[PDB]
Amino acid sequence: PVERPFSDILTSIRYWVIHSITVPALFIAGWLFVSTGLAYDVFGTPRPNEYFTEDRQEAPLITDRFNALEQVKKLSGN
Amino acid sequence: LLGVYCYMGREWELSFRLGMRPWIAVAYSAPVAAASAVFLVYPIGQGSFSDGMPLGISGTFNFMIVFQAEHNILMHPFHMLGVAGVFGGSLFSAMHGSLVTSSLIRYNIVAAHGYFGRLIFQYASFNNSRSLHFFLAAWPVIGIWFTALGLSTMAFNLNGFNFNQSVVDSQGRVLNTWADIINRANLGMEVMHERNAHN
Amino acid sequence: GLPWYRVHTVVINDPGRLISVHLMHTALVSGWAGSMALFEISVFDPSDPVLNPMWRQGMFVLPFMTRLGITQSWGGWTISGETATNPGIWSYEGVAAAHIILSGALFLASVWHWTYWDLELFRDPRTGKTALDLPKIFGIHLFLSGLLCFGFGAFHVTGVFGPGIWVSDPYGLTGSVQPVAPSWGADGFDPYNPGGIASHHIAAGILGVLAGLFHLCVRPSIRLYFGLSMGSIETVLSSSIAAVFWAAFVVAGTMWYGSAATPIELFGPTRYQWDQGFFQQEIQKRVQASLAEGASLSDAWSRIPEKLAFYDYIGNNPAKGGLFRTGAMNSGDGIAVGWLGHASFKDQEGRELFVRRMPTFFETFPVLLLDKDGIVRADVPFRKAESKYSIEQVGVSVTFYGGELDGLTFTDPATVKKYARKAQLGEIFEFDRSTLQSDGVFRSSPRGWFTFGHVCFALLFFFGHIWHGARTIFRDVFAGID
Amino acid sequence: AVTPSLKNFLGSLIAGATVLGGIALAITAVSKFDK
Amino acid sequence: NSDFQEPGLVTPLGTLLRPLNSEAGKVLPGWGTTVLMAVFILLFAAFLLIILEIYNSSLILDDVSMSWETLAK
Amino acid sequence: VGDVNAPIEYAVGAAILVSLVATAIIPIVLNPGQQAADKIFNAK
Amino acid sequence: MEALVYTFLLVGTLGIIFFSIFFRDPPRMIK
Amino acid sequence: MARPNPNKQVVELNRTSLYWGLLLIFVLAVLFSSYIFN
Amino acid sequence: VYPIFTVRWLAIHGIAVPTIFFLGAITAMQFIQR
Amino acid sequence: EVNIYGLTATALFIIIPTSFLLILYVKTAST
Amino acid sequence: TIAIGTYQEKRTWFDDADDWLRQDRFVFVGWSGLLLFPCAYFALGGWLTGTTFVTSWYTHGLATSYLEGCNFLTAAVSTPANSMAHSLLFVWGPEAQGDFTRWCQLGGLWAFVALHGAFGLIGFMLRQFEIARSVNLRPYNAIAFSAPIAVFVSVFLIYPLGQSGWFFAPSFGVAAIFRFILFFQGFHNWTLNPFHMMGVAGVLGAALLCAIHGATVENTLFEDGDGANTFRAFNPTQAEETYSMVTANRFWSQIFGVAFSNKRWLHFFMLLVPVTGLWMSAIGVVGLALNLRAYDFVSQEIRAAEDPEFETFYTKNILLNEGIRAWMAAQDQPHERLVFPEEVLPRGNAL
Ligand code: CLA
Ligand code: CLA
Ligand code: CLA
Ligand code: CLA
Ligand SMILES: CC(C)=CCC/C(C)=C/CC/C(C)=C/CC/C(C)=C/CC/C(C)=C/CC/C(C)=C/CC/C(C)=C/CC/C(C)=C/CC/C(C)=C/CC1=CC(=O)C(C)=C(C)C1=O
Ligand SMILES: CCCCCCCCCCCCCCCC(=O)OC[C@H](COP(=O)(O)OC[C@@H](O)CO)OC(=O)CCCCCCCCCCCCCCC
Ligand SMILES: CC1=C(/C=C/C(C)=C/C=C/C(C)=C/C=C/C=C(C)/C=C/C=C(C)/C=C/C2=C(C)CCCC2(C)C)C(C)(C)CCC1
Ligand SMILES: CC1=C(/C=C/C(C)=C/C=C/C(C)=C/C=C/C=C(C)/C=C/C=C(C)/C=C/C2=C(C)CCCC2(C)C)C(C)(C)CCC1
Ligand SMILES: CC1=C(C)C(=O)C(CC[C@](C)(O)CCC[C@H](C)CCC[C@H](C)CCCC(C)C)=C(C)C1=O
Ligand SMILES: [Fe+2]
């Protein structure tokens, strides 16, 4: 009930035992997230070779509000 | 220019004649350095006094626009530091005034410190009344020194940053970034400024 | 020794002086309304209601009077261009005189209440000190406001006893004051449907009454009484400031974006109609239908009314203007006098060309004659610049259909260039520029001025709300007491 | 008729109610645990 | 001061309206009726959201058209 | 196309260096603040 | 006419500045 | 004409306030005159 | 001193975990041939 | 005489606040 | 009669909640915390996620992300396309229809960040009020923060609401803000508007006051320490002030001409300057939102058009604005589909 000082945890053994095996897991998770290609699929960012579609050779344009979903699906080539 | 330099000297002279400490001239050096840069060092680097700042308002605006056209000042780190210094000075002035006025009751630093420590965390940062005022005096002065040095360096024409065509996909095509739009604006500005065909 | 900005706080305790002060302010505002009505009526010119409506002459308060039923005038004219025979008591001049008389009576009442400040009505039986029962007073005032709202909704707007309100067709071509039957379905919530107004002024009205009754029969809880400092008279000030803040944004938004309570035929068109090609698209559809039905191009283009062509002109866009470009719109680009007609540009090859209309943002925009495929085919050099495609070279020619210049054609490059630069702004018009000495810079319609002023006031009132609420919550600290 | 947009709006209302209820339950439970 | 500096002026309208300005400071015990206020506030917020989305084209209803064209009913 | 050239060996090598440098300096920066907050607290 | 107005406004500003500099009330509150 | 109001103070304006007000009004006029005249 | 899962724990972890994840992501992005 | 309305606006803005402040100063200085 | 004081009734759930929320811990949650922490956290998270992964290829035709190869200065969270005029861009709204990938592609992340950030500012102001009430101090920090919140509200919500759509609001980034500044310099002549002039004066005066006050206080300290450094010759529990007001007053009354003689007035002036400057700037941008711009100086334009041989810096500024507009609108506004031939582009060679 006193919010133990940071020094106490700094010298603890369980703290280090947990963190030294946990943090590397997060780092590798991020590395695999952006390496396996999941980021492009998840966030819709096109790959370097997908910017210009075969039938389109210029920046896209939405030019539509209530059908923006189909417009974006067509422009992206998916 | 001579008058402002001798004003700088007179500040120290009077400070010494009264028993005060002599470090107000150091603070005043920032605006003096900036004025000296803009009015004397830029023309020397460029080679003519026509490149100085006209003594007016629209003249100052044209001055700024011509820099943004020629040297891309906005992306120079020193101008960023100057903007940061000015904004931080305004912030600190406003907030110091607010806390001091609130504390003064018909305690000056030990009362408002409790408020500040729990408002935005950051306990025991400026608990000494002297360190706080020194920080106030130091931030904007350093910012202005850096921006003046940046203008002086631009006088000898290195440049601001340049990220034009920094992103390219496969096959060699170029994808535009915001820097490219800034560069288009600068290109139009520069083309408009130059007369070239002069009769 | 009160400073200059704490002077009026001397009235913060005695209610009688507060009553007198509020009466004085009410009298001032009523007098302003009357004086502006008289001035605007003195400056108004009712000759031409097509090419010289109210919104071209910088009128501000006249449309508000016209929006609720006031049409005729004592001079014999009407806002619709006809002639009045029986103006009656209720006309523009009558309304102005009534407002002035009200201002004077309120001033006399104000001075009376200022003289007699100590009345028994302002002292409670217990503790013998001045006090106001704020919850019960609020109940009474809310009851009255709700009753008035119901009356207005069910007697004036609906037309069962009153004249009604202004209703017009979508394109602002034929409008007038009519009764408005209520609409209860989901179609009663879109602000472009007039019915949704009347229903509201009924429904909410009833609720108002009910609310007031409650507020007159149930005392507030102790915890709420002390939490909101309901015994003080500055909390109510903060609440009222916040309410007017909110209302200012509501009204400004509805004026800018257009609604059924701000017809385009009284305040002028909005910028979003120019941006989306509303009137242009309507005219094109009508002309195409006329051609399909079978008729000559001149006949098809000679049937559209002049008002519809007037609405499609960028000079009427409220967006384009200046903060310091003072005066009415009629003093910016001259008073309109006629419609030349639709200008069609055709090059030597034979394909028709169209001029790229100027967007709202651009203060100055180059003229670009481009055909139906969207590819530029002619244009004018910036200023004495090298030319590859030019009006002189491509040799485009302009023909006029309908309007005054019906059936004429031009080939001189100077005239073609002039008419292209004129058409880039929209429908070509004729402007008399020698009466008002118009400079040549566009001005904003009443819509923009209203929105700007009320938004600025709303922000300042937000600051006022913050300040007064802070000074109410921190009463003891501010006063330097326990 | 119930258009899909209206269904999505009612779903959003339900989600907001759920979030507010969750926050209220969290504060209540923690306060009861500590007092 | 005595009774806040002696009694004030008395007028027929003042006597008539005195009852409406007598019980100043009276309150109910506990929280009274705050829960009803909370429920009504929530309902009003829902109504405001509905109208805001209707006028912003984020909630398209079958009957409403949301354009100037509705003036030609 | 858009794959990562470097292998996972460097991934783990850098993970070890950038994971045990941030989990041991996050309490050292906050220690002054937590030590002074208690002094400020329970006093006024 | 505009030039005279501008000159008058500038002269007035300078005059107020001078009067504030030289005819200020003494600062005896704290000194 | 009924009874003197106990709540009646008098406004006070020291010289520094007057100088500040004059400076403010003159500076605003200097800034805005050109725009007003166009 | 004994109890855990306090406000401070949640506050620090919430900004700590995503920071490490994004640092790993950016470090991986660095080694892309484009 | 160009922009008579502008000249009147400038004169009023320069006179009314100035007169108000000066009257206030003379009134208070009597204390 | 039955009188009553304060808190003389049975305890309730509200009492327990209030007791827990207003404790003394490393982080002060308070009632305003419930609104501040989630909103601010989500705003920051959204900004970082947008700047790291999401792109603006389908809205502006740009590439702005670390995954696409952008620096800290060029990455940003771009605004939604102009077709989405003023839609709030909910994930469940008619535009996205519940698809997260398409929601990110269309640009609803900007609206997410903006709305949650505005509510975070409101929560922060309420937090300041709560702290001030708890520790019994007058709330001046509330107004000092009311200035920047007003500026943010104006720029990021009222300006787009008057224009075509969200497309013209600032994009959260550095190069985006530079583009915004140049865009106003080109189209509105924002530098000539008096309100920005007043704001500039206010900000520069605030910096000047900060610097001068710091220098004067640090150069007039009393001798209350043997050590060469004056920082350790002080404790928070001091009785008197650490600097001589009389000496500084005389110094600045002999150098400049006018000097302060009241601490409260001095610090209140410090508070007053920047707030007024930023408020005036906010009013100026509010005016600009309706295209009510100070651009004309009609007399100068008429005189210049009458005869070419009359040039002032104002005319040169007008020409520079024309150049900016003509040369930047080509790619700044893709939805307009503008193609200016090189013949028509303004250039100084043709004057
Ligand atoms: C919000 C309320 C409002 C609105 C929207 C309008 C709108 C309008 N009025 Mg009305 N008017 C109003 C209130 C309002 N007025 C009031 C309260 C009065 C009583 C004085 C008048 C008296 C009045 C007259 C007598 C006339 C108008 C006219 C006009 C039209 C011309 C544009 C204009 O106002 O000038 C442009 C506005 C400005 C130049 C003001 C700029 C605003 C800045 C922010 C003020 C800055 C002040 C600054 C701090 C100090 C500067 C000092 C400097 C002068 C030295 C327009 C339709 C004219 C018209 O067309 O009638 C046919 C006209 O002749 N009005
Ligand atoms: C319903 C509206 C309302 C009401 C009844 C009050 C009433 C009051 N206010 Mg509040 N206030 C309001 C709105 C309101 N205010 C708003 C919107 C703001 C934000 C700008 C403020 C900001 C404010 C501050 C900062 C302070 C007050 C103070 C006061 C008190 C003294 C009046 C004063 O300033 O001295 C009289 C003022 C003058 C004689 C100066 C008038 C000169 C003005 C600035 C220019 C001319 C105005 C023009 C002729 C008319 C404009 C009309 C426009 C509103 C449409 C009084 C109880 C003061 C107080 O006692 O609190 C401690 C105080 O310090 N108010
Ligand atoms: C206090 C914290 C807080 C606040 C103020 C907001 C505020 C906001 N969020 Mg955020 N959000 C939060 C927490 C918060 N959120 C959390 C914790 C999450 C994670 C789960 C999210 C996830 C999130 C997403 C993913 C999105 C938002 C969005 C929004 C905006 C739309 C609000 C809306 O319509 O939602 C719903 C609001 C309500 C329903 C209001 C409550 C009214 C209740 C339900 C009344 C109920 C009474 C009664 C039963 C109704 C009767 C009618 C009918 C049922 C018969 C708004 C700015 C959206 C946005 O604008 O992004 C662009 C968006 O896309 N938020
Ligand atoms: C001497 C040069 C100069 C100076 C000093 C100024 C001064 C100013 N200009 Mg600029 N301007 C100039 C020249 C200059 N101008 C020129 C030549 C141009 C070209 C036309 C412009 C174009 C321009 C534009 C387009 C705008 C300005 C604006 C402003 C004002 C900025 C107000 C502010 O701080 O808002 C910035 C502060 C905020 C928005 C508050 C947000 C704070 C949030 C809550 C913090 C978020 C938390 C964060 C994540 C924490 C991280 C902290 C970390 C960074 C350490 C200020 C008065 C702006 C303005 O005020 O307009 C109203 C504006 O929009 N100016
Ligand atoms: C022909 C001619 C004449 C040519 C002139 C042409 C021309 C261009 C004219 C000028 C036009 C002109 C006036 C333009 C400016 C117009 C303009 C933009 C006005 C802005 C006005 C406005 C309302 C802005 C809002 C913001 C605002 C209020 C800003 C205030 C700015 C301001 C006054 C800043 C303070 C400046 C200043 C020097 C302060 C120093 C204070 C000082 C002496 C402190 C010293 C000090 C420190 C201590 O620590 C202690 C302890 C003591 C004791 C002490 O003393
Ligand atoms: C109860 C929610 C629990 C948390 C859910 C997960 C949250 C994280 C979401 C990440 C994005 C993933 C996509 C979700 C989006 C999604 O997949 O929605 C989909 C869902 C249903 O749409 P459908 O896919 O059925 O629509 C398909 C077609 O029929 C559309 O025409 O939409 C809703 O009903 C609303 C859901 C709100 C979900 C957000 C919860 C927060 C609501 C706002 C709270 C405001 C509080 C204000 C307090 C004052
Ligand atoms: C007593 C009486 C009478 C008469 C009366 C009268 C005739 C009155 C009048 C009155 C009037 C005739 C009034 C007026 C008023 C006015 C006003 C009150 C105004 C105001 C204004 C303002 C306030 C403004 C403001 C502004 C401006 C300027 C613009 C914008 C900005 C601002 C907002 C600042 C008789 C014998 C018959 C009978 C018995 C009773
Ligand atoms: C998804 C999403 C969400 C949420 C989110 C979040 C919540 C996020 C967060 C996020 C985060 C939380 C992030 C973070 C990040 C971080 C970072 C990214 C960092 C970085 C750093 C750096 C980069 C550094 C650098 C440096 C230093 C400082 C040291 C040394 C030096 C140098 C300079 C190198 C939701 C569902 C609601 C909705 C939708 C969207
Ligand atoms: C003594 C004691 C303390 C001091 C304590 O912190 C806790 C943990 C409660 C909680 C998990 O923090 C509950 C947090 C939930 C919170 C109510 C959600 C809404 C408010 C914020 C979103 C919380 C995060 C704020 C943080 C980011 C500063 C318990 C159980 C204890 O017994
Ligand atoms: Fe200080």
Numbering used by the authors:
A (entry chain E): 5 to 82
B (entry chain A): 120 to 225, 246 to 338
C (entry chain B): 2 to 483
D (entry chain X): 64 to 98
E (entry chain H): 14 to 86
F (entry chain 1): 38 to 81
G (entry chain T): 1 to 31
H (entry chain L): 1 to 38
Sentences from the study reporting this entry:
Photosystem II (PSII) catalyzes water oxidation and plastoquinone reduction by utilizing light energy. It is highly susceptible to photodamage under high-light conditions and the damaged PSII needs to be restored through a process known as the PSII repair cycle. To restore the function of PSII upon damage, oxygenic phototrophs have evolved a highly sophisticated process known as the PSII repair cycle. Here, we report biochemical and structural features of a PSII-repair intermediate complex, likely arrested at an early stage of the PSII repair process in the green alga Chlamydomonas reinhardtii.
In the high-light treated prf2 mutant cells, the PSII-M complex contains a small single-transmembrane-helix protein binding to Cyt b559 in a way resembling that of PRF2 as revealed by the cryo-EM structure. Especially, the membrane-spanning regions of PRF2 and PRF2’ are highly similar. On the other hand, the cryo-EM density of PRF2’ is slightly different from that of PRF2, especially at the site interacting with W35PsbE. When PRF2’ is associated with the PSII core, it induces conformational changes on the DE-loop region of D1 protein in a way similar to the one with PRF2 associated. Taken together, we suggest that PRF2’ may be a redundant homolog of PRF2 functioning in a similar way to inhibit electron transport on the acceptor side of PSII during the PSII repair process.
